[PDB]
Amino acid sequence: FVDYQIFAPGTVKVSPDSVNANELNPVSGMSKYIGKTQKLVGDQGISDRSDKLPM
Amino acid sequence: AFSSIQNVLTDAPLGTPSAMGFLDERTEKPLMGPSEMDELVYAVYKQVFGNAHIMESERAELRDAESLFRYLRDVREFVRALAKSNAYTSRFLQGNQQYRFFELNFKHLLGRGPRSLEEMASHSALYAEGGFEAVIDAILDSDEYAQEFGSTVVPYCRFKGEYPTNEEFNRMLVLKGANSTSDKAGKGRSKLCYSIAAGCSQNWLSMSKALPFGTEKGTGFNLISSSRNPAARPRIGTKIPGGVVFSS
Amino acid sequence: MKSVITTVVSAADAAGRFPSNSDLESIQGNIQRSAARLEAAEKLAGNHEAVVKEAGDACFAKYAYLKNPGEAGENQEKINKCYRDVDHYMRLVNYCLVVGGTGPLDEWGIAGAREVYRTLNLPTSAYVASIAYTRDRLCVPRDMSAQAGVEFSAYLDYLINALS
Amino acid sequence: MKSVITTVVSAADAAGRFPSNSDLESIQGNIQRSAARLEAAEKLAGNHEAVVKEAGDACFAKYAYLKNPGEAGENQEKINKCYRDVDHYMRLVNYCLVVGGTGPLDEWGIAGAREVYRTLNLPTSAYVASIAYTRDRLCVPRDMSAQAGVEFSAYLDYLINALS
Amino acid sequence: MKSVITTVVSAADAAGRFPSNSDLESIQGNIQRSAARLEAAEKLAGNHEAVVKEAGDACFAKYAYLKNPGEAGENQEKINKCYRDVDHYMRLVNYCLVVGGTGPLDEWGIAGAREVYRTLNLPTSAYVASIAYTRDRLCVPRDMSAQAGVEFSAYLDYLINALS
Amino acid sequence: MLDAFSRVVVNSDAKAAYVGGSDLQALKSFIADGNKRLDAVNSIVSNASCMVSDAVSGMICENPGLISPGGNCYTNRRMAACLRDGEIILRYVSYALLAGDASVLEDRCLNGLKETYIALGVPTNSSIRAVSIMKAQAVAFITNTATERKMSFAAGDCTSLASEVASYFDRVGAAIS
Amino acid sequence: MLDAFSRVVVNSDAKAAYVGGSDLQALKSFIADGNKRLDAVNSIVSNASCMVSDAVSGMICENPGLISPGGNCYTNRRMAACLRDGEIILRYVSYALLAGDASVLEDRCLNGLKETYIALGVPTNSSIRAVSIMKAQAVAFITNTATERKMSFAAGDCTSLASEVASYFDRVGAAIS
Amino acid sequence: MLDAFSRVVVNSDAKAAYVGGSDLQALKSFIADGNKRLDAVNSIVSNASCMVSDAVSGMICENPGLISPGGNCYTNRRMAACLRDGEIILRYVSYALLAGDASVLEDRCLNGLKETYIALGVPTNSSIRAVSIMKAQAVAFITNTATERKMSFAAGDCTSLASEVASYFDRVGAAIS
């Protein structure tokens, strides 16, 4: 694991997905960011693994 | 012992200023004065009696217990003097059954419901050895009354969160009602009497009438039955990788 | 929901009294100090994305150790739950400036927070450093009015006091 | 003592709370009504000997049977004690305009008075006929200001509802 | 499917006749109207994951009681089946703009629906509030054209009147 | 309880939305004529002793079998417990006119009230007439159309305040119906 | 309440029998394996704070509508009450594993629990899911097959204690269903 | 429990005069600086958790034998109780500053406080110091001369109200002596 305290201050960057209570989680549980409902996206089912090799 | 309802959704409990006034040697208490006094007496009259709506010619017989209360500022002695009155036995002892009288002593003087048949039968063991004054002074001089109310505050219905039985919270909610609710509406007839002696529980709509404002009063009821079947043996299985294990 | 109206009639009900001539004066204070706490509230409503974007990375510029394995913001779901929990708090600061008292904060945001954040190892000092960043980010003639900054920076350090 | 300040500091003490923003908004309403309920209070301090001498000699205009023997004021000695018990109320109406609440009325001039006026055979309905004579003789646009009228008339009407 | 072709073929099959001159005149209406209703069916088929998820939480923004115990939005599976069942309905509206009639909505979405949403206790006014939100979200020059929005909304309130 | 400002907050928390710029002109127009809410709650509670007396005394004059033996305000303990029982109905309406919302009327006064009035033999069809007499008297104090007690107000209208309090008396008038 | 020795003597009291050497061979093996019963309950109370917070937040993970507006784990007020409740359930099943009889879990904790939850609005399908996570956490500490946190035991089988405590966790689901 | 308006009337019932024109100017010089009093009491309650924790920890620094074994702030149970006590003292002085009258502090807090500390062994020579730390820290936050946290105010004179809240800390240090 990276320690993240041994770096200089200002070099660890973080960024949230949206600064909103209502896009991170709606009134229903259909949240794209919080919880186990991050697999329910219409894309991101297949991938690009014909980039590498037949290894 | 967190209790998400208590000082959040209800009010704060009323009472005297402090308990350090008894150790003060030039006074007996922070002296409240007769606007700060009688509005505390309004809260003892609304709690020991239910909402009994006592008249002007019924409060005149309680003239002596207030005149001692505004000098000796103990709240517990005022509650003890009001439970030995004629106005407490003509409402809760005279035309009621024995477990109706006992279940209102837990409401008026403890703010909870009785947890057991063994706890309830020991209050009838004190009726045989001293009558109704042996029941009342044993509640007042108990350890449970000392470490919740003391001499300082009125005995209020306290949402604790960490009840010693879960059924104790249920019988507290049946006993208190809404604020437009007194305790003469049944003709005698203890409400908790069947559930104490059998060991079952209460009805969900009767408890959720007495819950505060803002606590989902009634939802969660499936449209099938409201209690549990003690004879049912369900199969609850856990998924492991291979199959499903019924650790029963 | 402690406000000016929901305390003067929760004392009028505790003695069994009518609306007194005392309590008709306390709603005359709701007429006067409304226009500094409504104009501080409406400024927060059209600027909310900007003020919680800057408040949230004040936690992470300060505390780089939170991305370590086992700490609070160790993955992107937890970073998204950090910026949610400071979007909730300043929504309640917007709510307290409408009701006029500290009612919506201490029964939706503060009650339970000692017990929730201890069990989940969320540090209180990182919650404070986000809210104390935007308390002195407030500029007195530039952002809002003079007395409107007093109302907005009364509920902020209420929340810094009650968390610490 | 019932005032507008003692309500919000006993409601803060009962929950163990510091004086927050809803409490300080209620003191701001006491600054607004102080320009009317003090000017009516100072008007009653110099005009009393022409208005407590208007009430009781018109109390006996409606209630003529109180000068009869066997009733209350059968001699001149008790009428001079009848003008003491209406100078004791206008001196307490004057105090509650100064302090804002109903404190000097309810805990001095009201508490206990149901039982003294029951046992000592004094009719309460001549006090109601005499306090209300100072209500309808009061007009606004010569005697006092507009909001000094409606604060004085709302404090004469408090103990009319308490004695009835 | 109930369509323009299958109506005029079935009408001329029960009568036992060849396609007449009035049966070819109806398919010409299917030509001049196909430009508008295929624009709506292509606009919907490209942006359907964002239209479904915007309407799925418009159910729970109106009816927050569905997360209570025993209700239909308790756990994660029940909201996965709820966003599915809304996406099923938006697929059938895409199928109705392509075919040209209410065929796929009748046979696959509406027939048998009253007996399922009552047996499983799904509140049918919440399978409506998501459909009614999409009908008023549509801006008539922004997303599609004028006549493409007439066709899009007319299949959207056919479903509303069939659930009501 | 919720007042008229905290009602708008618990509607927007269901949306998880900030109280923006569109709801605030329903709350700046609450406090604009907000003198008149204080200038008319004072018109009820100044006359509230006479108002409960004329309410139940007109309840006798249209159902004269209440004071017959068997009726529920026959004896002298029962007649004192319905002068005072309509004091509490008049008190929680005057809280709700001060608050702008019927939350403190419904939680603290209307919950379980009919549930006890069938348990005590209170005839609920004649207690509706007890409420609706003082409903008519309260809305003419606010309108200042009474015969006696012409309380000097300022010029304008309180037509919406007269109908908000008439909705509050219809809430208690439908709860025990 | 009873324990595993008191459960035998109330069975013999229905027959007025003596607890003799036929009945005593179940109780002579309860004391023979009695070191392993103590060895298993400090495998649970040493990890009990980690077990509760993983089970409650693992229930939030499979159901994110519990923390949206209208979920019943929404604010700090409701989430701390859910964390308190799962610690109470884990406390009473550690009493029941120690005694060897599920009496004290069934009358104090579970009796009347279904009626509290349908009056307070608590969802019972997700509440069963938080108990069913910490059932699987409890059988992994007893058999020493957890991925972190290998504790130091002695060698043998504790496979009848792991399924005895799995039946105590199954009574919680059967009582709130 | 009085305030500053309820002090001039309990000095005037003894003479039984109307409060007339001569003594009403002393309360018109209360509502002149009424917004000055409201601006002053907001600055204490915004800094109150820092004012206590700097005071009690400086008492440990000025008196390092307090955390020795046998000391009064030795263990964690005792150290939390002294921080609990300084919260109540700073709360009751701020009640007195808002009312403008010491009769909220002297009754509800100072009755029996001298006899309780000698019954518990709480030493008064350190609590005269730790009250007097936050006495001098309260006049910094009123007159804006604090080192950190320059709060935003209006330009005027507040040195009468800073001395008036110094006198409430003299009423504490007299009574616990």
Ligand SMILES: *[C@@H](C)[C@H]1/C(=C/C2=NC(=C\c3[nH]c(C[C@H]4NC(=O)C(C=C)=C4C)c(C)c3CCC(=O)O)/C(CCC(=O)O)=C2C)NC(=O)[C@@H]1C
């Ligand atoms: C969200 C808007 C709702 C809510 C909805 C639920 N609907 C549920 C099940 C369901 N929906 C349908 C109709 C759907 N299936 C189809 O094949 C087609 C057309 C091609 C449609 C429109 C069916 C037949 C079913 C039952 C079968 C199933 O399990 O999918 C549902 C599941 C019910 C359950 O879990 O028992 C939910 C929860 N839930 C809400 O809270 C609001 C009301």
Ligand SMILES: *[C@@H](C)[C@H]1/C(=C/C2=NC(=C\c3[nH]c(C[C@H]4NC(=O)C(C=C)=C4C)c(C)c3CCC(=O)O)/C(CCC(=O)O)=C2C)NC(=O)[C@@H]1C
């Ligand atoms: C505290 C961290 C303990 C510890 C506890 C264990 N947890 C075990 C299993 C487990 N945990 C979760 C919740 C986790 N999964 C998620 O998807 C999410 C977020 C949404 C979380 C927080 C689940 C679902 C499970 C499995 C339960 C099941 O299968 O139904 C566990 C079991 C053993 C194992 O993981 O192999 C233990 C012991 N683990 C530790 O070492 C520290 C002491």
Ligand SMILES: *[C@@H](C)[C@H]1/C(=C/C2=NC(=C\c3[nH]c(C[C@H]4NC(=O)C(C=C)=C4C)c(C)c3CCC(=O)O)/C(CCC(=O)O)=C2C)NC(=O)[C@@H]1C
């Ligand atoms: C199954 C849960 C474990 C495992 C368990 C075994 N533990 C065995 C013996 C054992 N455990 C303790 C400590 C326990 N006894 C106490 O009295 C107290 C507290 C007061 C505790 C925590 C002791 C003392 C012993 C006895 C051996 C010794 O004295 O060192 C054990 C041996 C069988 C038996 O003698 O009962 C087993 C199999 N070992 C495992 O591999 C799984 C993971």
Ligand SMILES: *[C@@H](C)[C@H]1/C(=C/C2=NC(=C\c3[nH]c(C[C@H]4NC(=O)C(C=C)=C4C)c(C)c3CCC(=O)O)/C(CCC(=O)O)=C2C)NC(=O)[C@@H]1C
């Ligand atoms: C809260 C953290 C405020 C704050 C208040 C102030 N305290 C001030 C001075 C002060 N602090 C102590 C305790 C300190 N001195 C020590 O020697 C030790 C450790 C052993 C500690 C913790 C003392 C004794 C004093 C001086 C009191 C006196 O002698 O008059 C102070 C400066 C003086 C003043 O302006 O009041 C302030 C502002 N300090 C802060 O920065 C935040 C805002």
Ligand SMILES: *[C@H](C)[C@H]1/C(=C/C2=NC(=C\c3[nH]c(C[C@H]4NC(=O)C(C=C)=C4C)c(C)c3CCC(=O)O)/C(CCC(=O)O)=C2C)NC(=O)[C@@H]1C
């Ligand atoms: C009238 C003849 C006197 C007078 C009377 C006052 N007594 C006051 C209080 C008081 N009186 C008693 C004695 C009485 N009350 C009882 O309960 C019992 C025993 C059952 C007896 C004999 C007590 C105990 C008290 C104190 C209780 C209380 O605080 O009310 C009193 C009130 C004083 C005050 O306002 O603090 C009065 C005025 N005083 C007189 O000047 C005349 C001569």
Ligand SMILES: *[C@H](C)[C@H]1/C(=C/C2=NC(=C\c3[nH]c(C[C@H]4NC(=O)C(C=C)=C4C)c(C)c3CCC(=O)O)/C(CCC(=O)O)=C2C)NC(=O)[C@@H]1C
């Ligand atoms: C960001 C400044 C923090 C940080 C925060 C995390 N918070 C996590 C969860 C969380 N936050 C709250 C409070 C919030 N929820 C509400 O409903 C309201 C008011 C309406 C507020 C303020 C709660 C109750 C929870 C727990 C439940 C949940 O998941 O939503 C969180 C996830 C917890 C976990 O890791 O298991 C994180 C990471 N993270 C940071 O690094 C700083 C300290």
Ligand SMILES: *[C@H](C)[C@H]1/C(=C/C2=NC(=C\c3[nH]c(C[C@H]4NC(=O)C(C=C)=C4C)c(C)c3CCC(=O)O)/C(CCC(=O)O)=C2C)NC(=O)[C@@H]1C
């Ligand atoms: C017309 C009434 C207004 C207007 C409204 C806005 N709509 C906004 C976003 C938006 N609208 C829709 C629905 C519509 N687009 C579609 O693709 C379909 C069906 C296939 C429909 C019914 C969606 C899905 C979205 C989100 C995606 C996006 O456009 O960013 C919008 C932006 C704010 C918002 O997120 O809602 C506005 C202001 N816009 C106008 O200019 C006229 C005045």
Ligand SMILES: *[C@H](C)[C@H]1/C(=C/C2=NC(=C\c3[nH]c(C[C@H]4NC(=O)C(C=C)=C4C)c(C)c3CCC(=O)O)/C(CCC(=O)O)=C2C)NC(=O)[C@@H]1C
């Ligand atoms: C968390 C896993 C649940 C959940 C829990 C909530 N429980 C709430 C209140 C509550 N829970 C209990 C039962 C508990 N207390 C006991 O004393 C015993 C047995 C000894 C048990 C099992 C009681 C009695 C109460 C009410 C008392 C009180 O808290 O004052 C609760 C609060 C509801 C509210 O704020 O309205 C919650 C949220 N809810 C969930 O969603 C998960 C599944």
Ligand SMILES: *[C@H](C)[C@H]1/C(=C/C2=NC(=C\c3[nH]c(C[C@H]4NC(=O)C(C=C)=C4C)c(C)c3CCC(=O)O)/C(CCC(=O)O)=C2C)NC(=O)[C@@H]1C
């Ligand atoms: C702190 C700066 C002191 C100090 C304080 C201690 N006080 C302890 C107990 C205690 N303190 C009070 C008074 C407090 N309670 C109130 O209600 C009010 C005002 C209204 C005040 C000031 C009481 C009544 C008690 C007894 C209750 C209890 O013990 O919790 C205490 C603990 C004593 C013990 O553990 O036996 C401490 C350490 N001690 C110090 O060194 C500084 C000077």
Ligand SMILES: *[C@H](C)[C@H]1/C(=C/C2=NC(=C\c3[nH]c(C[C@H]4NC(=O)C(C=C)=C4C)c(C)c3CCC(=O)O)/C(CCC(=O)O)=C2C)NC(=O)[C@@H]1C
């Ligand atoms: C002494 C501590 C300061 C200083 C104080 C002054 N403050 C003045 C005015 C002022 N303060 C407030 C806010 C206050 N009123 C409220 O109703 C509430 C909360 C509910 C608070 C916190 C207001 C509204 C005002 C009035 C001016 C305005 O409306 O903008 C002030 C001016 C005189 C006065 O009205 O009191 C002074 C001198 N200024 C100083 O020099 C020191 C540092």
Ligand SMILES: C=CC1=C(C)[C@@H](Cc2[nH]c(/C=C3N=C(/C=C4\NC(=O)[C@H](C)[C@H]4CC)C(C)=C\3CCC(=O)O)c(CCC(=O)O)c2C)NC1=O
């Ligand atoms: C603080 C208590 C207080 C009151 C209740 C009134 C009462 C009052 N009225 C009058 C005396 C008077 N007051 C009026 C005024 C009026 N007559 C009417 O019918 C009109 C409605 C009204 C005009 C505003 C008149 C015309 C007289 C002289 C006639 C009389 O004796 O009433 C006097 C004699 C001295 C004086 O004129 O002030 C007093 C004390 N004034 C007070 O200071």
Ligand SMILES: C=CC1=C(C)[C@@H](Cc2[nH]c(/C=C3N=C(/C=C4\NC(=O)[C@H](C)[C@H]4CC)C(C)=C\3CCC(=O)O)c(CCC(=O)O)c2C)NC1=O
């Ligand atoms: C059977 C015997 C019998 C009675 C006792 C009275 C009772 C009574 N009074 C009023 C009617 C009224 N009651 C009042 C109230 C008051 N009027 C005042 O002069 C005071 C200031 C205040 C308290 C006494 C007013 C102002 C009206 C007139 C209608 C109105 O203006 O609202 C009404 C009409 C209510 C309605 O229409 O529903 C009734 C039934 N009438 C009867 O038939």
Ligand SMILES: C=CC1=C(C)[C@@H](Cc2[nH]c(/C=C3N=C(/C=C4\NC(=O)[C@H](C)[C@H]4CC)C(C)=C\3CCC(=O)O)c(CCC(=O)O)c2C)NC1=O
């Ligand atoms: C917060 C709201 C609130 C209320 C409204 C009351 C509701 C209420 N009223 C009564 C009690 C009563 N209520 C009535 C009222 C009436 N009977 C009639 O014939 C008229 C139609 C009507 C108005 C005069 C009477 C006569 C009694 C007394 C019955 C009795 O003495 O048994 C009781 C029983 C009290 C007791 O004696 O123990 C209660 C709870 N209490 C509350 O706390």
Ligand SMILES: C=CC1=C(C)[C@@H](Cc2[nH]c(/C=C3N=C(/C=C4\NC(=O)[C@H](C)[C@H]4CC)C(C)=C\3CCC(=O)O)c(CCC(=O)O)c2C)NC1=O
């Ligand atoms: C502490 C107690 C307290 C009060 C009693 C009120 C007193 C009060 N009422 C009004 C003011 C008013 N009052 C009325 C009301 C009416 N005029 C009528 O002809 C109708 C009969 C009646 C409707 C109910 C109107 C119309 C105004 C002026 C417009 C407004 O600002 O609301 C005003 C503003 C001054 C003015 O506009 O003249 C004040 C201070 N306010 C308080 O703070």
